[PDB]
Design a binder for these strands. Structure first.
Ligand SMILES: [Mg+2]
Lengths: 120, 45, 217, 192, 136, 99
RNA sequence: GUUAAUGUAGCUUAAUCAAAGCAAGGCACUGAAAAUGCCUAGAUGAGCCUCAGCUCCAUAAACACCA
């Protein structure tokens, strides 16, 4: 029932959402954050994190993206948030690492594409 | 430093078979030309 | 503060023949061969080899090899120039024909009145002259040889000062096209030398830093 | 009638003279990044953040905590360096990487997480849900000791309470199983 | 808004500009508009060295303006046959040309540059330095 | 008046059928990939010593030219200018067999 | 041998979750670059100590020196 932020729409990405998945790729590490429109990071998984870093190899690999996605799905269910929006770049949508990040996120039980507003 | 760019393949998408050829110009000098014909040597008069 | 004016020269011989390949470069050359021939489209030679190898089997029941063997014998009969004109001699540092693979540089032997000098060839320039002109002049005059050497810039390569007086040694780069050495048996000792050997024969700290602006290859 | 800028103007830094010798980001993405870093700084002009409620903005935090665990920096660093050398050494691992087949033992990562940075994540989730705002009113503590709560839905069924999760009142009809790790000189108080 | 302190915050167009002589001063001496002609018989080789040149320039901050291919010259080589006295036989070759244009230089950078270019010369590669005026 | 050779000739169209198979085991695949990574490390170190080399050369240029300016100003009047001798610089690459 | 400083990866982070970001490389893609995709290597100057201190080494900047 709450208010999303309709607007902008000169600029990008759409700021309309309660929660947004944000995937930053450094030349070294892959960092997946879940954000609130406040900018506040709610729940995240990074490869700089020792928990993930120590189990696996080559922090920048496709493997790492899949991993981080699975971890994040887990932590999201644990946080009580089942929905978020993901707005990738057209060329990021074609890339494998991200396709498999989304797959991990989906099998994890987290739906992208938030439910609509009520009496929007 | 002579071997810097020496190691390469032809990057065009659709191309014939290219085979190593030893080419002697009129020096006494020999060069390596990639040529479609398997012949191991050619020489210019 | 009197200033002693001395031009100087770094004389570069062109590496003639290419070097053999590092093990890694060789394995990589192999890989590039394989992968190049993997994406390759047919061959004319191979069209006429394969199509006829297949069609002759259909003319028996109901060329390429000639060319192959021809080129084999024409290649095998022919013989090539030696890659080593140095180590078959194995002696001469004073031969300009010594090393085909690397670039070579000129050194000279001088014993002066108060001094003992192993010398990267040096010039003496009068204040009215240009460092360039004195470089060229000293080159053609000292070695008693006819040298086509294409110089690069009007700017000098590297500089080293010995202050007793005060003095300057300005080294220039000259790229040797074709030298003609007159009196190949002359007494003045001219040593044509690689990087490692330039490291070896050089006593001074003025000539020790020449391998700093040298091309190591 | 001009006024005078208060403090720095944003692009006033880079030189307009000789634009060709300036490096550009030819990537859309690099730009996006630089822009999002610029959007997080405290500017002197009316901004989105200002009106839209950063929620007290800067706040000095009264901290009622358990004191942070004391661990040696250099020792830890060495140990991790070594572990990663070992893990990077194996050829098996590299095969698992190139061929896109690998898995992470999620239970062990949940373990390490609970041990290491977990407290901080749990903290900011609590801040998100405003636990601290309705409880201690100003105060943030870091949950140093992990708290494991569960409900019995049946004989074989166990419904865990993580931070923020949803649970049905049917499950919660009975008092939950509570677990945490402490030796005993200890005394504790639990509150729902 | 003109009256406000924040005026011209959105101002950009001076940052992006969207709308030949060598300078020889004898002390700061900039000799520009130079043409690098890389000519060789092998396609792959000439392309690889042209590539190396290009990348080298981009790393050295030396500004490259135009990098393009020159029309290939097709050679027909006529070899003498011994049996038939004046009889000719034939073999076909091709000459490939690539071009890299650099817009600026100094004395010291010329001296330095040429060293690296000719040191790294691959076998069967002919190098040329010239001036911007050429006719295609 | 531009005519490029980048175009694919007409001869090459229908003779395509000559090279259909390519297959590798675990061996050739893993070998080639490992070799490639190795090669990248190598090429990197190579570019590094290359750049460090030209940098040391340029530093010799700094010390040199600055020494000559500090001694005689007339000499960086002379030698800081670029000579007309550099216009048609031509150099031939090494060969396999000496003449 | 003397004074003002230092020794983080090529330049700049952090050193209470943590050695971070950017350059820079390879291969694939189109003619070259560029973008993009899949990949690659990396550091707290070295020796002990207390749980910042003592030296060494080396650079750098001067001076002295040496030729
Ligand atoms: Mg640490």
């Amino acid at each position: 029932v709450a208010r999303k932020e309709r607007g902008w729409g000169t600029v990008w990405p759409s700021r309309e959402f309660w929660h947004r998945l944000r995937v930053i790729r450094t030349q070294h590490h892959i960092e997946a954050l879940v954000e609130h429109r406040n900018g506040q990071v709610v729940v995240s998984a990074s490869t700089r994190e020792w928990a993930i870093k120590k189990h696996l190899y080559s922090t920048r690999n496709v493997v790492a993206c899949e991993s981080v996605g699975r971890v994040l799905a887990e932590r999201c269910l644990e946080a009580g948030i089942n929905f978020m929006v993901y707005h990738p770049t057209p060329w990021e949508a074609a890339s494998d690492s991200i396709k498999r990040l989304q797959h991990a996120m989906t099998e994890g039980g987290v739906v992208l594409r938030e439910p609509r507003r009520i009496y929007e | 430093d002579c071997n810097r760019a020496l190691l390469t393949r032809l990057h065009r998408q659709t191309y014939a078979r290219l085979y190593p050829v030893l080419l002697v110009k009129q020096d006494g000098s020999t060069i390596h030309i990639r040529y479609r014909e398997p012949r191991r040597m050619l020489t210019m008069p | 503060s009197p200033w002693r004016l001395l031009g100087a020269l770094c004389l570069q011989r062109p590496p003639l023949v290419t070097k053999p390949l590092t093990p890694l470069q060789e394995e990589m050359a192999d890989l590039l061969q394989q992968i190049e021939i993997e994406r390759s489209l047919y061959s004319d030679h191979e069209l006429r080899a394969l199509d006829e190898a297949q069609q002759l089997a259909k003319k028996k029941s109901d060329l390429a090899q000639d060319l192959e063997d021809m080129w084999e014998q024409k290649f095998l009969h022919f013989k090539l120039g030696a890659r080593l004109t140095e180590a078959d001699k194995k002696d001469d540092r004073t031969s300009l024909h010594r090393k085909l693979d690397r670039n070579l540089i000129l050194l000279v032997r001088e014993k002066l009145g108060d001094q003992d000098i192993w010398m990267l060839p040096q010039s003496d320039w009068q204040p009215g002259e240009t460092l360039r002109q004195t470089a060229e002049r000293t080159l053609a005059t000292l070695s008693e040889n006819n040298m086509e050497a294409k110089f690069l810039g009007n700017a000098p390569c590297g500089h080293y000062k010995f202050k007793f007086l005060g003095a300057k040694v300005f080294f220039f780069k000259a790229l040797l096209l074709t030298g003609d050495f007159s009196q190949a048996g002359k007494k003045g000792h001219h040593v044509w030398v690689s990087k490692e050997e330039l490291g070896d024969y050089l006593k001074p700290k003025y000539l020790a830093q020449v391998r700093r602006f040298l091309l190591d290859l | 009638r001009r006024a005078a800028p208060l403090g720095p103007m944003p692009n006033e830094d880079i030189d307009v003279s000789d634009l060709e010798r300036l490096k550009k980001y030819r990537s859309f993405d690099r730009y996006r990044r630089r822009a999002e870093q610029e959007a997080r700084k405290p500017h002197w002009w009316r901004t989105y953040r200002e009106h839209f409620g950063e929620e007290s903005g800067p706040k000095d935090r009264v901290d009622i905590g358990l004191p942070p665990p004391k661990v040696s920096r250099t020792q830890q660093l060495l140990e991790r360096k070594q572990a990663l050398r070992e893990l990077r050494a194996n050829v098996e691992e590299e095969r698992a990487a190139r061929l896109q087949t690998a898995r992470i033992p999620l239970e062990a990562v949940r373990a390490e997480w609970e041990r290491t940075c977990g407290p901080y994540h749990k903290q900011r989730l609590a801040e998100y849900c405003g636990l601290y705002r309705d409880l201690f009113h100003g105060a943030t503590f870091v949950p140093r000791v992990p708290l494991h709560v569960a409900y019995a839905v049946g004989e074989d069924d166990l419904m865990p309470v993580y931070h923020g999760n949803e649970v049905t009142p049917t499950e919660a009809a009975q008092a939950p199983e509570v677990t945490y790790e402490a030796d005993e000189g200890s005394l504790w108080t639990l509150l729902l | 808004y003109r009256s406000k302190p924040t005026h011209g915050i959105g101002r950009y167009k001076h940052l992006v500009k969207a709308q030949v002589r060598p300078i020889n001063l004898g002390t700061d001496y900039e000799y520009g508009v130079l043409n690098i002609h890389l000519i060789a018989y092998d396609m792959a080789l000439a392309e690889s060295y042209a590539q190396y040149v290009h990348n080298l320039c981009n790393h050295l901050a030396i500004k490259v303006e135009e990098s393009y291919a020159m029309p290939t010259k097709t050679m027909e080589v006529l070899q003498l046959q011994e049996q038939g006295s004046k009889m000719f036989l034939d073999a076909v070759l091709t000459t490939h040309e690539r071009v890299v244009q650099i817009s600026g230089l100094s004395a010291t950078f010329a001296e330095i540059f040429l060293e690296i270019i000719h040191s790294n010369l691959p076998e069967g590669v002919k190098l040329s330095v010239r001036e911007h005026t050429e006719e295609d | 008046i531009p005519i490029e050779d980048f175009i694919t000739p007409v001869k090459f169209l229908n003779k395509e059928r000559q090279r259909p198979p390519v297959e590798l085991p675990f061996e050739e695949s893993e070998r080639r990939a490992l070799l490639l990574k190795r090669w990248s490390l190598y090429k990197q170190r190579e570019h590094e010593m290359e750049r460090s080399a030209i940098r040391s050369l340029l530093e010799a240029q700094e010390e040199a030219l600055q020494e000559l300016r500090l001694s005689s100003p007339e000499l960086h009047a002379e030698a800081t200018k670029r000579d007309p001798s550099l216009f048609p610089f031509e150099r031939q690459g090494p060969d396999y067999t000496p003449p």
